Amino acid sequence: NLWVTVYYGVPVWKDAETTLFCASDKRNVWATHCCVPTDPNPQEIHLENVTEEFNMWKNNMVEQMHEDIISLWDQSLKPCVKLTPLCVTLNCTNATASNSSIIEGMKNCSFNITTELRDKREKKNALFYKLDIVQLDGNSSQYRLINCNTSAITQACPKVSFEPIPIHYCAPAGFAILKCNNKTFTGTGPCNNVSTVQCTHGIKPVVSTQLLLNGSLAEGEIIIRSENITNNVKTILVHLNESVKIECTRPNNKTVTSIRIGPGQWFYAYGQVIGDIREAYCNINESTWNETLGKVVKQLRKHFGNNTIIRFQPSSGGDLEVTTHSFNCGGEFFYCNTSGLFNSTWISSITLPCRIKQIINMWQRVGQAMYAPPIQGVIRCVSNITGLILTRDGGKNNTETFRPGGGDMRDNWRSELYKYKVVKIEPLGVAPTRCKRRV
């Protein structure tokens, strides 16, 4: 009695991977690259009686944005000035400010550089953070840029703004974005309250190593997500339901010196110091940090035992990018000592000193080093901590030690896209029915 019938436009789909489109809302780099409106997307389609398995540890969207951000970064740096002539011998000394007060950083170096005429060199002076420079064979007052034995460095154009903006990722035709809405969802498994969208919400492509910045405030409850809570290989992400305010600052007021390299080529360095000497640092509310860690420890106890003792210790070792809290602030690049935060044990006005360096091997690549230009004037920025990156070491029974490991770069963004999945529409289907084609 039953006969084949073919239906076109069935509302079903399969898992897939595809290039999603990037859209957003002197110049901001993302706005030009993702130069397409996102305003006319006010609605979502709730799906009645659908269950779908999410896996935030196998999202291809996070990989896509990693490759997209690095591609954008490379493209934006590509036409900018090169600093190869600055890889010369430097005659260096201690810098000073006010009544000849020596600066902790700020090696003052002089260098012979070629001007617009190839047959003409001039001595020029510049101050540099001590972390960008390496001594030449232990000889006094002989130094080179840290780059000079790796690759040529590019100066980021001062006119472009690398401040992240909200980014929306939109399905191409024949594809859709499924978003879980279960507020207690732990990043993996079935979700039975799902809404389909054409575009994601606004996620800022923030960069950070060990603390999670300027993100969404998790859900109503603090959520700890892991591909395996037991395994020590996997990074542990903590998602806070309340933001923690942090005020980071470079207080030193300085002049910026503008040097000509060649035809149409300009270099910018830190010139004379204007104000008095003060360290770069971040301020964090001590009490707030305490109850936040307490709540996170309670949620950890829910996984590791109610009678378990849980302690936090600093990151064991590695490059600044591994152990320091690395980030951008006002266009400058900070690396902060977080040992004053992750030193505690649990049974049942914090000032982070901060180093600043201008030459960065972002994404731990060999070569392709970026030189951050200086910024004239004091820098002060405020950020919301929304989550944490924790590394579990294991050890003795009923002892749980976690450290603020930097994790992978992708973990900075898995923290934001855990709700999202991409699906390919499969409009074609077949079924039996009582009806049969005539003739």
Binding site: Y8, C35, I45, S71, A173, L428, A431, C435, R437
Partner: protein, 142 residues
């Protein structure tokens, strides 16, 4: 209301079929077109050769999937329709669910999964059936 009947039982999605036919092609493609056309997108991103090649490839693949589906509808006869029957009897051994639950108490997603591994057999049957039908019509006219 795209995918609005995805979790509804089979048959509830029939009246939504016209909605689901759109946005595979020409529902989102012209929206993305005008949205990219307004800010001369790709026009000032021509220099981003990688980005342009990726977007052109994605649009081409949307087109190609649409052509593949339409052409498979063609070779089975009775294309240009959201609903059509054939003359091929149902082989009950595929699911043996000889019930009214084919139009109740089960969603299209579940059904597509349940017979997910007999897709090619159905396709070959439809192909041979249309071949016979076309030759039969040619003989009848002649």
């Amino acid at each position: 209301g795209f995918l609005g009947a995805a979790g509804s039982t089979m048959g509830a999605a029939s009246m939504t079929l016209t909605v689901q036919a759109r946005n595979l092609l020409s529902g989102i493609v012209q929206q993305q077109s005008n949205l990219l056309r307004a800010p001369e997108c790709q026009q000032h991103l021509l220099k981003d050769t990688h980005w342009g090649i990726k977007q052109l490839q994605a649009r081409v693949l949307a087109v190609e999937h649409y052509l593949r589906d339409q052409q498979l509808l063609g070779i089975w006869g009775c294309s240009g329709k959201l609903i059509c029957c054939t003359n091929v009897p149902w082989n009950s051994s595929w699911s043996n669910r000889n019930l009214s639950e084919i139009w109740d108490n089960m969603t299209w997603l579940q059904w597509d999964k349940e017979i997910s591994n007999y897709t090619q057999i159905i396709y070959g049957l439809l192909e041979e059936s249309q071949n016979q039908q076309e030759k039969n019509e040619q003989d009848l006219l002649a």
